Amino acid sequence: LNPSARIMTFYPTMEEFRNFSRYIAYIESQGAHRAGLAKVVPPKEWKPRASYDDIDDLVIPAPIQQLVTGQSGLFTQYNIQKKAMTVREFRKIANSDKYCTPRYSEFEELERKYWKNLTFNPPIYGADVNGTLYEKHVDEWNIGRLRTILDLVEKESGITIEGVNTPYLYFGMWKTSFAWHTEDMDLYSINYLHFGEPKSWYSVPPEHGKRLERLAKGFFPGSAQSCEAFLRHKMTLISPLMLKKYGIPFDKVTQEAGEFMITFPYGYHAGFNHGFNCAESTNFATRRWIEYGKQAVLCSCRKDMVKISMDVFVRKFQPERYKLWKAGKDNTVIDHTLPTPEAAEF
Ligand SMILES: O=C(O)C(=O)N[C@H](Cc1ccc(OCc2ccccc2)cc1)C(=O)O
Ligand code: NI
Numbered sequence: 001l002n003p004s005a006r007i008m009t010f011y012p013t014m015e016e017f018r019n020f021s022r023y024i025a026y027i028e029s030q031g032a033h034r035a036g037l038a039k040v041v042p043p044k045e046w047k048p049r050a051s052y053d054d055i056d057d058l059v060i061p062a063p064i065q066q067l068v069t070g071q072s073g074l075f076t077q078y079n080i081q082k083k084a085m086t087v088r089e090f091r092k093i094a095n096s097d098k099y100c101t102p103r104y105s106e107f108e109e110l111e112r113k114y115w116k117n118l119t120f121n122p123p124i125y126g127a128d129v130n131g132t133l134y135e136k137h138v139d140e141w142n143i144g145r146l147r148t149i150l151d152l153v154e155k156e157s158g159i160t161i162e163g164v165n166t167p168y169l170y171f172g173m174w175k176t177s178f179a180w181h182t183e184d185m186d187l188y189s190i191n192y193l194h195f196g197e198p199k200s201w202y203s204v205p206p207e208h209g210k211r212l213e214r215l216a217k218g219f220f221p222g223s224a225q226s227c228e229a230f231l232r233h234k235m236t237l238i239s240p241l242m243l244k245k246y247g248i249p250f251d252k253v254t255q256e257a258g259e260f261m262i263t264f265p266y267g268y269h270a271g272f273n274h275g276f277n278c279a280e281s282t283n284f285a286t287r288r289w290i291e292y293g294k295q296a297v298l299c300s301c302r303k304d305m306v307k308i309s310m311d312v313f314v315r316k317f318q319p320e321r322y323k324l325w326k327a328g329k330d331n332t333v334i335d336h337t338l339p340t341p342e343a344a345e346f
């Protein structure tokens with residue numbers, strides 16, 4: 001059952017596709033979650049939007065310039081918040097000689113220049129934009145409404161959390177980065193690349209996550225003492241040579257326009273954008289996440305403030321265990337290898 005924990009790809013027919021929660025349970029029955037990250041190529045006649053000609057006017061309220069500091073494959077990224085700007089401006093800068101993708105043969109070559117150059121000429125990421133590019137009538141895999149048990153949060157408390165149960169758009173240019181992290185509350189995530197250049201990704205298997213944190217702690221001892229979960233600040237960059245050199249297993253995969261990626265609970269991932277592009281993203285859940293939600297180690301220094309109440313989930317899906325949990329005595333140990341309960345039928 002994916003015993004080497006490789007990153008997997010799936011091409012679901014239009015009908016395997018229509019029901020989202022069940023396609024996730026399917027890929028878990030096939031071993032995908034063990035890699036932490038998977039790719040799903042939608043069926044060629046599926047489409048979320050007719051055209052992107054019309055967005056040049058859309059506002060990016062808070063772009064950020066990414067300053068990166070470090071050497072020897074260990075880096076910290078600092079975010080400069082810049083002035084609001086529309087997409088067409090962002091595109092001009094992305095495609096300007098100043099900021100655009102260097103020329104290259106194989107991916108491995110672009111990968112090398114990213115790692116060699118990521119502290120130079122800091123770029124700007126149109127990150128964290130509230131909104132969606134899905135036509136309002138598209139029903140399969142609409143990041144606006146996946147319809148998973150994550151919806152229990154909004155429904156029961158009214159609470160919406162931007163980018164977690166609402167969608168984010170991310171406008172990329174060359175060399176923009178996403179630091180090593182698992183999702184808030186260790187939720188799953190979904191990323192659709194609407195268009196532009198690729199987004200490349202690295203991933204560590206959840207069953208080795210602990211090994212990545214142990215490591216990251218030695219590498220950034222200062223940050224660890226000030227916060228258990230410093231990685232959740234999303235400021236820590238670590239190259240694959242370092243991972244490789246300290247024997248931490250990971251895989252790499254490159255995502256193209258029109259492709260989806262899913263991350264799994266507690267799957268550490270990172271990457272960078274190849275050039276002008278645009279991805280949309282949100283978090284979701286399945287029954288199996290609940291236990292990761294109860295056990296997630298959270299930012300203790302209050303930079304990352306996102307925190308979902310588990311109560312509703314435990315009561316509703318783990319009735320027997322509610323009281324043991326509540327009196328802080330639920331000692332379940334997660335087994336990162338199991339598919340979610342919803343998968344049995346496969
Ligand atoms: O789909 C996902 O799970 C995912 O992590 N996508 C990433 C989202 C991300 C994650 C971490 C990032 O680190 C930099 C940063 C952190 C906080 C605020 C603004 C920028 C930046 C972006 C992406 O597409 O760039
Ligand atoms: Ni993520």
Ligand SMILES: [Zn+2]
Pocket residue numbers: 226227228229230233299300301302303304
């Ligand atoms: Zn913290």
